[PDB]
Amino acid sequence: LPSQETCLVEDLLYILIGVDGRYISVQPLVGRQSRSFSVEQNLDSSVKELVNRILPVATNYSTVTRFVEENSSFEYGQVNHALGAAMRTLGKEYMILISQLEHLQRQGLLSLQKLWFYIQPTLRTMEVLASIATSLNKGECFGGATLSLLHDRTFGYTGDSQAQELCLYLTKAASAPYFDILERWIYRGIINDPYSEFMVEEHWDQRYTIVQQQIPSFLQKVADKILSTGKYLNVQAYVERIEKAYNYAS
Amino acid sequence: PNVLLQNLCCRILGKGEADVAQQFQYAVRVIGSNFAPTVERDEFLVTEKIKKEFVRQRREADGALFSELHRKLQSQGVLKNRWSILYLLLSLS
Amino acid sequence: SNGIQISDLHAVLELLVELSGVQVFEADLGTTVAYQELEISTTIQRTLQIM
Amino acid sequence: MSAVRETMDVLLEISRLLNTGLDMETLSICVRLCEQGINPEALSSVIKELRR
Amino acid sequence: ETMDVLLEISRLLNTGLDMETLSICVRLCEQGINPEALSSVIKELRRASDTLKASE
Amino acid sequence: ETSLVRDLLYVFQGIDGKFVKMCNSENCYKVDGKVAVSKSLKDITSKLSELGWLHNKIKKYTDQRSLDRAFGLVGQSFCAALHQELKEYYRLLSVLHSQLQVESSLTLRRLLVWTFDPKIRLKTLAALVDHCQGRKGGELASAVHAYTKTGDPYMRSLVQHILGLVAYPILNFLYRWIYDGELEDTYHEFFVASDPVVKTDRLWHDKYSLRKSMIPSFMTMDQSRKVLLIGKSINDLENAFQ
């Protein structure tokens, strides 16, 4: 009975790295984007139903390993490629938390509930990162609507103080290239897109369009403000920046 | 315990006794009610925090250098309870 | 204060210094029960000694 | 004795890199507290005040 | 005041002093008898005192 | 025999152990298996069954906490706040699970008192889950505000921790509407109406109204004046927010 928990704690830790178990095997069903795990029969049925509680942590971990594979396969130069670079960071710091648990089994011990309350701080972070990644999996977006999508989710989460901080680090690494190509428009009216990574696309006076494949920051009107600054160069709090940035370069 | 902690006040404050008395009182109160570690023991977690600190500041060379220094500390085989020493130096960077 | 019948208060306190020396509720109870347990046994052993 | 000197040299090097502003005397005291099983969290807080 | 106050402190420090004896010691300090001497003196007198009580 | 002592630890963790159990109206069921132990420990393990039934009243909320985002913004605070409570239970139980291993908690009069401090907390947190079903504010505020009027100053502190979290989106709608001139509604969990009446050219025409079905009851009835000041002007808190 205390022995059947100990080796399954060790098997659970092996899965969470992303590596096949001794008694937990991994079967792809959707191509390992969500893993249909099967733990094989153990003599004690009590420890087997508790082990099942800890396997969806690993299903949500497969969601993020396909996120960082997904944007690389397309070779973007977009801010979606950089959204994944953050999820690789949250993925590097995760690994320290499993490896500690691993260290704790070597000498000294962790029972199943000793496992349970240490996993418990990060299965909640995983599930918020997993749902941003599955909503994004449609083979979209290019620059501006990636940003539009992540802002709505930050304005959703409002009042759970938890995801305000986690969505805070994601939305500023996503904005790290975006405010580059923003400046190029408000001080020179020039474009800097490898693809189309900036909402105001181009093709004097010039033939500007906007697309809703790159939806504006929250509001359509401030994207229209940047339409009107750049012509003149040719001859919550973030959309707010624009309205007075126009009107000091008018 | 009682002596070492008083020594701490004396060197920093650069004053002897009957000068550091009130400070002593804060220190005694705050150390005693939380005497034993409130974290699970683990050398590796603290080390990683020190190297991330180097990377965040873009001091990559020193981050590698540090890795050599921790092996030197560990190897001598004199000080055990190493995590707490390291932990302290990281909090005060 | 300055004492009303004290006047070397530092030395008096000093003399006292030199002569110095859930589960919260079960620690306190456990001690109370264990101290009475010690007593019953010391009276018995003592009577055992006279014989 | 000698290993105890060499070890302190390693620690002084750990201190310079992190900009702690602990001397040879301040570090040696800290170590000694640390070896007796004091919580580093508590210990860091006391230090900050003592510098004030 | 001071004596009730001191009698609590004596008790928290578990020293071995009662109210009657403490009162005599206070007058000894004020007459300039060293704390270290006076602590010595209490200990010796007690040891003998207890040895005499067990004989009674 | 000793297997039975293990089996109850898992009724706190879940609803189910070695024997198949179920919850009906109340209480995790007990099979003590074969006779070979006293007809009187099953009563001990019935006192302990209500804590497995009370665990699963918080557990469904936390399954509803761990959503993409939907069922209130108030309604996802009551559950998120209750999750910070769910994790404190686990650490008591894993330290209680650490005693059971041979070295104790083989005894049963001590499993009883080790869960009693958890019990006083968790039944009023279960009762507060029966007290909720709304997933819009102005009546979820009326839920945690009513448990801070009832006596027993041991449970008054518990329900004060949920009040400040249940209020935390409600106030995030208040100071932002000063700033931007936007109002957050997904389901109408903010207590002002938003396009009740079609827009007209301004004369202070109604397009914001307080509502008599949903109002934060942390506010007496003073919130009425508060929302027509802020709404007109674009076009914890008991009266400590202007």
Listing DSSP states for A154-215 in one string gives: HHHSTT-SHHHHHHHHHHHHSHHHHHHHHHHHHTT-----SSS-SSEEE-----EEE-SSS-
Q: Residue A210's CB: how many other CB atoms inside 10 A?
A: 18
Q: Residue C1's CB: how many other CB atoms inside 10 A?
A: 8
- Rounded CA gap, F108 and F128, in Å? 30
In this structure, what token pair is assigned to residue B43? 């050398």
Closest CA to A87 of A60, A48, A115: A60
- Strand-pairing partners, residue A26, are A37
- Rounded CA gap, A190 and A202, in Å? 9
Of F66, F74, F165, the CB nearest to A127: F66
Measured at the CA of A211, the angle between CA F195 and CA A247, to 5 degrees, comes to: 70
Contact F80, F47 (CB under 8 A): no
> Looking up tokens 């004989």, which residue turns up?
E55
| Three-state DSSP class for residue A243 | helix
Q: How far apart are the first and last CA of chain E?
A: 37
- Rounded CA gap, A169 and A154, in Å? 11
Going from the C-alpha of A92 to that of each of A87, A88, C12, the distances in angstroms are: 9, 6, 63
Q: What crossing angle do the helices spanning B43-56 and B60-75 adopt, rounded to 10°? A: 160
**For the stretch F192-220, what's the b/e string if a residue is b when 16 or more beta carbons lie within 10 angstroms of its beta carbon?**
bbeeeeeeeeeeeeebbebeeebbbbbbe
How far apart are the CA of F25 and the nearest CA of chain A, in angstroms? 23
Tell me which residues of chain E have a C-beta less than 8 Å from any C-beta of chain C: 1-3, 6, 9-10, 13-17, 25-26, 29-30, 32, 34-36, 38-39, 42
Q: What crossing angle do the helices spanning B2-13 and B21-32 adopt, rounded to 10°? A: 130
Q: What crossing angle do the helices spanning F116-130 and F156-166 adopt, rounded to 10°? A: 50
- Rounded CA gap, B54 and A239, in Å? 34
Q: Could you tell me if A158 lies within 8 Å of chain B, comparing CB atoms?
A: no
Residues 23-42 of D with CB under 8 A from B: 23, 25-26, 29-42
- Rounded CA gap, A137 and A73, in Å? 13
* D20 Cβ contact list (under 8 Å, min separation 6): B89, B92, B93
For chains A and D, tell me whether 3 or more CB atom pairs sit within 8 A of each other.
no
| Three-state DSSP class for residue C9 | helix
What is the C-alpha radius of gyration for chain E, rounded to an integer number of angstroms?
13
Q: How many CA atoms lie within 13 A of A179 on its CB side?
A: 11
- β-strands A200-202, A208-210: how paired? antiparallel
Closest CA to A119 of A98, A102, A89, A88: A98
In this structure, what token pair is assigned to residue D50? 């003592």
- Rounded CA gap, F94 and F87, in Å? 11
Chain B residues closer than 8 Å to A100 by CB: 40, 42, 44-45
Q: Which of E21, E30, E46 to mutate to test binding with chain C, by most C CBs within 10 Å of its CB?
A: E30
Q: A37 phi and psi, to 5 degrees?
A: -75, 145
Contact F114, F105 (CB under 8 A): yes
Residues 28-67 of A with CB under 8 A from F: 44-46, 49-50, 53
**For the stretch A16-46, what's the b/e string if a residue is b when 16 or more beta carbons lie within 10 angstroms of its beta carbon?**
bebeebebbebeeeeebbbbebebeeeeeeb
**For the stretch D11-31, what's the b/e string if a residue is b when 16 or more beta carbons lie within 10 angstroms of its beta carbon?**
beebbebbebebeeebbebbb
Contact A222, A185 (CB under 8 A): no
| Three-state DSSP class for residue F28 | strand
Determination approach: cryo-EM
Going from the C-alpha of F229 to that of each of D38, F178, F207, the distances in angstroms are: 56, 10, 13
Going from the C-alpha of B46 to that of each of A103, B59, B93, C5, the distances in angstroms are: 14, 18, 13, 57
Please report which helix (H) or strand (E) contains residue F11, including its range.
Answer: helix F9-13
Q: What crossing angle do the helices spanning A112-119 and A2-17 adopt, rounded to 10°? A: 30
* F35 Cβ contact list (under 8 Å, min separation 6): none
Put residue A111 in one of left, alpha, beta given phi > 0 → left and psi -120 to 50 → alpha: beta
Q: F57 phi and psi, to 5 degrees?
A: -65, -40
> Looking up tokens 């002569």, which residue turns up?
C19
In this structure, what token pair is assigned to residue F56? 């699963």
- Rounded CA gap, A51 and F55, in Å? 18
- Rounded CA gap, E55 and F8, in Å? 61
- A247 exposure class (CB count in 10 Å sphere: 0-12, 13-18, 19+): exposed
Long-range contacts of A99-104 (CB under 8 A, 24+ apart): A99/B44, A100/B40, A100/B42, A100/B44, A100/B45, A101/A13, A102/A13, A103/B42, A103/B44, A104/B40, A104/B42
Q: Which of F109, F113, F121 to mutate to test binding with chain C, by most C CBs within 10 Å of its CB?
A: F113
In this structure, what token pair is assigned to residue E31? 């007459």
- Rounded CA gap, B76 and B73, in Å? 6
Q: A209 phi and psi, to 5 degrees?
A: -135, 170
Query: DSSP characters for F184-200?
Result: --SSS-SSS-SSSS---
- Strand-pairing partners, residue A36, are A27
Chain C residues closer than 8 Å to E6 by CB: 6, 12-13, 16
Please report which helix (H) or strand (E) contains residue A153, including its range.
Answer: helix A143-156
Query: DSSP characters for chain B?
Result: -HHHHHHHHHHHHT--SSSSHHHHHHHHHHHHTT-S-SS---HHHHHHHHHHHHHHTT-HHHHHHHHHHHHHHHHS-----HHHHHHHHHHT-
Q: How many CA atoms lie within 13 A of A142 on its CB side?
A: 15
Put residue F194 in one of left, alpha, beta given phi > 0 → left and psi -120 to 50 → alpha: beta
Q: How far apart are the first and last CA of chain C?
A: 59
Q: Residue C45's CB: how many other CB atoms inside 10 A?
A: 8
Contact F90, A120 (CB under 8 A): yes
* E1 Cβ contact list (under 8 Å, min separation 6): C1, C3, C4
Q: What crossing angle do the helices spanning A175-186 and A162-173 adopt, rounded to 10°? A: 50
Nearest Cα residue in chain B from A103: B42
Going from the C-alpha of B26 to that of each of A7, B6, D25, D45, F157, the distances in angstroms are: 47, 11, 22, 10, 29
Taking an 8 Å cut-off on Cβ atoms, the answer to whether A100 and B48 are in contact is no
Nearest Cα residue in chain D from B51: D18
- Rounded CA gap, A49 and A72, in Å? 38
Nearest Cα residue in chain A from B48: A96
How far apart are the CA of B45 and the nearest CA of chain A, in angstroms? 7
- Rounded CA gap, D31 and B84, in Å? 9
- Amino acid present at A237: A
- Amino acid present at B71: R
Q: Which of B85, B86, B90 to mutate to test binding with chain D, by most D CBs within 10 Å of its CB?
A: B85
Q: How far apart are the first and last CA of chain B?
A: 25
> Looking up tokens 């500023």, which residue turns up?
A172
- Rounded CA gap, A249 and A233, in Å? 8
Closest CA to A61 of A15, A5, A108: A15
Contact A234, A206 (CB under 8 A): yes
The size of the B-D interface in CB pairs under 8 A is: 120
**For the stretch F130-165, what's the b/e string if a residue is b when 16 or more beta carbons lie within 10 angstroms of its beta carbon?**
eebebbbbbbbbbbbbebeeeeeeebeebbeebbeb
- Strand-pairing partners, residue F28, are F23
Closest CA to B5 of E32, A242, D30, F2: D30
Closest CA to D33 of D12, D19, D47: D47
| Three-state DSSP class for residue F59 | helix
In this structure, what token pair is assigned to residue E44? 């010796």
Taking an 8 Å cut-off on Cβ atoms, the answer to whether F90 and A113 are in contact is yes
- Strand-pairing partners, residue A200, are A210
> Looking up tokens 């957050």, which residue turns up?
F184
Query: DSSP characters for A9-54?
Result: HHHHHHHHHT---SSEEEEESSSSSSEEEEEPP-S-HHHHHHHTTT
Taking an 8 Å cut-off on Cβ atoms, the answer to whether A104 and B42 are in contact is yes
- Rounded CA gap, F193 and A170, in Å? 33
